[PDB]
């Protein structure tokens, strides 16, 4: 693996990321009788087991399969939410979200604004597996968050672990705005830690500083947080460099203040993501940080991203912004 996963609220049980998602969904339907879950193959428990047992527990009218049609799944979910009922849509891979792009961007995101708040689809959440998986190639590996980041009126949220996933997913489900929740699929089985059995929330639009540091700020989300955590370890050991490691968590609206506060302290910033460099969300963070922290920045902000190509099958190990590519970029930025 290109990464290693490392691991108050009542009783906890060890859960992997798919189980934490099921736990979030189970808690949601238990406490909200309007809530339904639907999409391709969710009835038997889903192709990544995220809905196992839920149809048996809650009923076929509440956890059900749709026809194979993403523009339909999202339009359908919007219409449920228009009536005020919680609609938890699944899109089977984030790579196949694009047929629904018009329903998300022209409809869901704009529903409240364009009606003057006479109607809304706030009770819609769209959840979808995301990010690389070792051999997913062009259409089972994508990270589409930057496409959505340019659309006012939706929220886009990506967890890094089972504890994070359940708390952020419950927040998405309960938030009064259409949310896209991207689940890093490589972590579905790989990442396991203690997760509260009962519901709890983690706030949206809030980054988490998972390791304090003084020489450089590192920002990522999803699986890539584990890569930069290792990079922080490599930098300490090899270079005597102290890294502040931040998980952004919410792509939009993003926590500008937490990132700027960090860079004001450290003077240096490296942002990394699996998605291609050009038009990637690191561009928005880098621009903004430059605008707010100009006088504090000691070196150009570094972006270590996927290359500007489609996501390859056999070349995956060479494509991803792995710990060595991040480390090397950091080293140069430290030397700057």
């Amino acid at each position: 693996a290109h990464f290693t996963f490392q691991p108050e609220y009542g009783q906890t049980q060890k859960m992997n990321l798919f189980q934490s998602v099921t736990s979030a969904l189970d808690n949601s339907l238990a406490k909200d009788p309007t809530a339904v879950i639907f999409g391709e193959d969710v009835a038997f428990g889903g192709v990544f087991r995220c809905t196992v047992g839920l149809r048996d527990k809650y009923g076929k009218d509440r956890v059900f399969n749709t026809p194979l049609c993403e523009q339909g799944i999202v339009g359908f979910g919007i219409g449920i939410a228009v009536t005020g009922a919680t609609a938890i849509a699944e899109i089977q891979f984030a790579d196949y979200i694009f047929p629904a792009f018009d329903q998300i961007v022209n409809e869901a995101a704009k529903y409240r604004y364009r009606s003057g708040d006479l109607f809304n689809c706030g009770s819609l959440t769209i959840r979808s597996p995301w990010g690389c998986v070792g051999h997913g190639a062009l259409y089972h590996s994508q990270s589409p968050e930057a496409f959505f980041a340019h659309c006012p009126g939706i929220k886009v949220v990506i967890p890094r672990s089972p504890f994070q996933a359940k708390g952020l997913l419950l927040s998405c489900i309960e938030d009064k705005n259409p949310c896209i929740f991207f689940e890093p699929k490589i972590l579905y089985r790989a990442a396991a830690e203690e997760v509260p059995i009962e519901p709890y929330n983690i706030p949206l639009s809030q980054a988490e500083v998972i390791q304090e540091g003084s020489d450089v700020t590192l920002v990522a989300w999803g699986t890539q947080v584990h890569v930069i955590r290792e990079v922080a370890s490599m930098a300490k050991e090899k270079l005597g460099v102290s890294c502040e490691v931040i998980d952004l968590r919410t792509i939009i609206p993003w926590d500008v203040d937490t990132i700027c506060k960090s860079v004001i302290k450290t003077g240096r910033l490296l942002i990394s993501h699996e998605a291609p460099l050009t038009g990637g969300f690191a561009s928005e963070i880098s621009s903004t940080v430059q605008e707010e922290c100009f006088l504090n920045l000691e070196a150009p902000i570094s972006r270590v991203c996927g290359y500007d190509t489609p996501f390859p099958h056999i070349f995956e190990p060479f494509y991803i912004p792995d710990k060595w590519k991040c480390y090397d970029a950091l080293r140069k930025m430290i030397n700057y």
Binding site: V74, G75, G79, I80, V82, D102, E107, R114
Partner: peptide, 21 residues
Amino acid sequence: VTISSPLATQIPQAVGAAYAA
């Protein structure tokens, strides 16, 4: 429900509202 310019988008929405009803 508020009219929007993009054609036919309300069709699958109306279906979801009917399922909720």
